[PDB]
Amino acid sequence: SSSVPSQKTYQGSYGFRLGFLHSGTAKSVTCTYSPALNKLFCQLAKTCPVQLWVDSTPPPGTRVRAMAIYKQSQHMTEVVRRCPHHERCSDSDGLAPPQHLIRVEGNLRAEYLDDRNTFRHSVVVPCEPPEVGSDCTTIHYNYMCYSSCMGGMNRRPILTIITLEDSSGNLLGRDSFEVRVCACPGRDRRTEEENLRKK
Ligand SMILES: [Zn+2]
């Protein structure tokens, strides 16, 4: 009956967890991850590589879904969506509905859900085994609004929840991370890490 998605980490039977590239904090960087904050900083609409790690290969038809929720208690029940400006920008990639914050880049089998009961948005792809040479698979996400967008996120922090699901949509595994979509991810990461250190 509930409609706030769980954010509880759950490796489950296949040992599912995320990984992120070591991109550093140069002012040219477009996506960078802070382990200390469990937080991804990225530029608007730029590629965000997220690694999917498992201890064992899940069955054919396993899928991976991404969904954003507001991190603060008082905002958790509100659907995370694009702002009144971006949803009207005609920046369709062919597949993503205009209201969806999170897109997957470069995957023909990406499916976008507007949940009929909760009204939440998500994007889901087939979970593919690592290519020869790789130990993991990578999904490329894009975030299509700034954290600061007025009438959208409006400076409120979000989490992305990544779920590993069977072909029916049943939970196999879960992980999550905070996201800030910003003009200078490198600088903003250095700043927030400094603040944490000082605290
Ligand atoms: Zn926006």
PDB file of C-alpha atoms in Angstrom, residues 31-133:
ATOM      1  CA  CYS A  31      30.984  13.698 -13.289  1.00  0.00           C
ATOM      2  CA  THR A  32      32.787  12.872 -10.027  1.00  0.00           C
ATOM      3  CA  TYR A  33      31.934  10.695  -7.056  1.00  0.00           C
ATOM      4  CA  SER A  34      32.580  11.338  -3.358  1.00  0.00           C
ATOM      5  CA  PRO A  35      32.794   8.124  -1.248  1.00  0.00           C
ATOM      6  CA  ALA A  36      32.924  10.091   2.011  1.00  0.00           C
ATOM      7  CA  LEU A  37      29.606  11.740   1.212  1.00  0.00           C
ATOM      8  CA  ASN A  38      28.244   8.826  -0.948  1.00  0.00           C
ATOM      9  CA  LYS A  39      27.407  11.555  -3.437  1.00  0.00           C
ATOM     10  CA  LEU A  40      27.722  11.943  -7.215  1.00  0.00           C
ATOM     11  CA  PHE A  41      28.328  15.460  -8.587  1.00  0.00           C
ATOM     12  CA  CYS A  42      27.599  15.856 -12.292  1.00  0.00           C
ATOM     13  CA  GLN A  43      26.916  18.457 -14.947  1.00  0.00           C
ATOM     14  CA  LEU A  44      23.552  18.823 -16.605  1.00  0.00           C
ATOM     15  CA  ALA A  45      22.828  16.102 -19.176  1.00  0.00           C
ATOM     16  CA  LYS A  46      26.394  14.735 -19.158  1.00  0.00           C
ATOM     17  CA  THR A  47      27.306  11.051 -19.039  1.00  0.00           C
ATOM     18  CA  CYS A  48      27.370   9.548 -15.533  1.00  0.00           C
ATOM     19  CA  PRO A  49      28.965   6.065 -15.579  1.00  0.00           C
ATOM     20  CA  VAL A  50      27.723   3.800 -12.822  1.00  0.00           C
ATOM     21  CA  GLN A  51      29.256   0.357 -12.360  1.00  0.00           C
ATOM     22  CA  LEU A  52      27.118  -2.629 -11.446  1.00  0.00           C
ATOM     23  CA  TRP A  53      28.978  -5.292  -9.475  1.00  0.00           C
ATOM     24  CA  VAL A  54      27.765  -8.786  -8.629  1.00  0.00           C
ATOM     25  CA  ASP A  55      29.362 -11.801  -6.927  1.00  0.00           C
ATOM     26  CA  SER A  56      27.366 -14.115  -9.234  1.00  0.00           C
ATOM     27  CA  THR A  57      25.598 -13.708 -12.555  1.00  0.00           C
ATOM     28  CA  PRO A  58      21.832 -13.161 -12.166  1.00  0.00           C
ATOM     29  CA  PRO A  59      19.385 -14.976 -14.472  1.00  0.00           C
ATOM     30  CA  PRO A  60      18.545 -13.898 -18.065  1.00  0.00           C
ATOM     31  CA  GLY A  61      15.822 -11.245 -17.904  1.00  0.00           C
ATOM     32  CA  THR A  62      17.214  -9.593 -14.775  1.00  0.00           C
ATOM     33  CA  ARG A  63      16.859  -5.791 -15.005  1.00  0.00           C
ATOM     34  CA  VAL A  64      18.310  -2.656 -13.372  1.00  0.00           C
ATOM     35  CA  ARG A  65      16.082   0.302 -12.485  1.00  0.00           C
ATOM     36  CA  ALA A  66      16.979   3.840 -11.424  1.00  0.00           C
ATOM     37  CA  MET A  67      14.639   6.140  -9.503  1.00  0.00           C
ATOM     38  CA  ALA A  68      15.165   9.491  -7.767  1.00  0.00           C
ATOM     39  CA  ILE A  69      13.622  10.454  -4.407  1.00  0.00           C
ATOM     40  CA  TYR A  70      14.070  13.548  -2.249  1.00  0.00           C
ATOM     41  CA  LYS A  71      16.518  12.873   0.546  1.00  0.00           C
ATOM     42  CA  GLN A  72      14.851  15.048   3.219  1.00  0.00           C
ATOM     43  CA  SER A  73      11.988  13.539   5.280  1.00  0.00           C
ATOM     44  CA  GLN A  74       9.622  16.385   4.557  1.00  0.00           C
ATOM     45  CA  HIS A  75      10.113  16.073   0.752  1.00  0.00           C
ATOM     46  CA  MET A  76      10.283  12.275   0.414  1.00  0.00           C
ATOM     47  CA  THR A  77       6.605  11.885  -0.519  1.00  0.00           C
ATOM     48  CA  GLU A  78       6.945  14.362  -3.426  1.00  0.00           C
ATOM     49  CA  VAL A  79       7.687  12.919  -6.884  1.00  0.00           C
ATOM     50  CA  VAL A  80      11.047  14.028  -8.229  1.00  0.00           C
ATOM     51  CA  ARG A  81      10.469  15.461 -11.686  1.00  0.00           C
ATOM     52  CA  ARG A  82      11.966  17.955 -14.098  1.00  0.00           C
ATOM     53  CA  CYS A  83      11.287  21.669 -13.586  1.00  0.00           C
ATOM     54  CA  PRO A  84       8.598  23.631 -15.525  1.00  0.00           C
ATOM     55  CA  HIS A  85      11.333  24.930 -17.876  1.00  0.00           C
ATOM     56  CA  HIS A  86      13.216  21.694 -18.709  1.00  0.00           C
ATOM     57  CA  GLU A  87      10.097  19.562 -19.134  1.00  0.00           C
ATOM     58  CA  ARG A  88       9.099  21.936 -21.949  1.00  0.00           C
ATOM     59  CA  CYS A  89      12.531  22.163 -23.694  1.00  0.00           C
ATOM     60  CA  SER A  90      12.074  19.705 -26.523  1.00  0.00           C
ATOM     61  CA  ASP A  91      15.248  17.852 -25.578  1.00  0.00           C
ATOM     62  CA  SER A  92      13.707  14.422 -26.174  1.00  0.00           C
ATOM     63  CA  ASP A  93      16.295  11.740 -26.967  1.00  0.00           C
ATOM     64  CA  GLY A  94      13.621   9.730 -28.734  1.00  0.00           C
ATOM     65  CA  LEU A  95      12.620   7.601 -25.741  1.00  0.00           C
ATOM     66  CA  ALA A  96      12.629   9.422 -22.404  1.00  0.00           C
ATOM     67  CA  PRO A  97       9.398  11.227 -21.519  1.00  0.00           C
ATOM     68  CA  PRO A  98      10.054  14.975 -21.047  1.00  0.00           C
ATOM     69  CA  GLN A  99       9.192  14.999 -17.327  1.00  0.00           C
ATOM     70  CA  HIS A 100      11.803  12.340 -16.351  1.00  0.00           C
ATOM     71  CA  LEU A 101      14.922  13.559 -14.503  1.00  0.00           C
ATOM     72  CA  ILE A 102      16.943  10.404 -15.081  1.00  0.00           C
ATOM     73  CA  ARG A 103      17.729   9.032 -18.526  1.00  0.00           C
ATOM     74  CA  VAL A 104      19.886   6.173 -19.710  1.00  0.00           C
ATOM     75  CA  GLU A 105      22.234   7.025 -22.578  1.00  0.00           C
ATOM     76  CA  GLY A 106      22.963   4.691 -25.488  1.00  0.00           C
ATOM     77  CA  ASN A 107      20.666   1.738 -24.716  1.00  0.00           C
ATOM     78  CA  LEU A 108      17.866   0.806 -27.138  1.00  0.00           C
ATOM     79  CA  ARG A 109      16.198  -1.400 -24.541  1.00  0.00           C
ATOM     80  CA  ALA A 110      15.753   1.335 -21.901  1.00  0.00           C
ATOM     81  CA  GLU A 111      12.155   1.551 -20.731  1.00  0.00           C
ATOM     82  CA  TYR A 112      10.629   4.497 -18.882  1.00  0.00           C
ATOM     83  CA  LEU A 113       7.886   3.931 -16.317  1.00  0.00           C
ATOM     84  CA  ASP A 114       5.340   6.368 -14.967  1.00  0.00           C
ATOM     85  CA  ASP A 115       3.975   4.302 -12.130  1.00  0.00           C
ATOM     86  CA  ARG A 116       0.142   4.208 -12.374  1.00  0.00           C
ATOM     87  CA  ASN A 117      -0.236   4.080  -8.574  1.00  0.00           C
ATOM     88  CA  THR A 118       2.653   6.126  -7.104  1.00  0.00           C
ATOM     89  CA  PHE A 119       3.182   8.495 -10.049  1.00  0.00           C
ATOM     90  CA  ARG A 120       6.966   8.046  -9.632  1.00  0.00           C
ATOM     91  CA  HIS A 121       9.270   7.927 -12.641  1.00  0.00           C
ATOM     92  CA  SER A 122      12.003   5.392 -13.341  1.00  0.00           C
ATOM     93  CA  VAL A 123      14.129   4.050 -16.150  1.00  0.00           C
ATOM     94  CA  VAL A 124      14.960   0.328 -16.413  1.00  0.00           C
ATOM     95  CA  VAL A 125      17.351  -1.629 -18.660  1.00  0.00           C
ATOM     96  CA  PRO A 126      18.303  -5.328 -19.003  1.00  0.00           C
ATOM     97  CA  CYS A 127      21.184  -6.331 -16.742  1.00  0.00           C
ATOM     98  CA  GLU A 128      23.882  -7.423 -19.200  1.00  0.00           C
ATOM     99  CA  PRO A 129      26.932  -9.595 -18.213  1.00  0.00           C
ATOM    100  CA  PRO A 130      30.397  -7.921 -18.305  1.00  0.00           C
ATOM    101  CA  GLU A 131      32.077  -7.766 -21.704  1.00  0.00           C
ATOM    102  CA  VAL A 132      35.252  -9.798 -22.200  1.00  0.00           C
ATOM    103  CA  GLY A 133      38.028  -7.974 -20.371  1.00  0.00           C
TER     104      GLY A 133
END
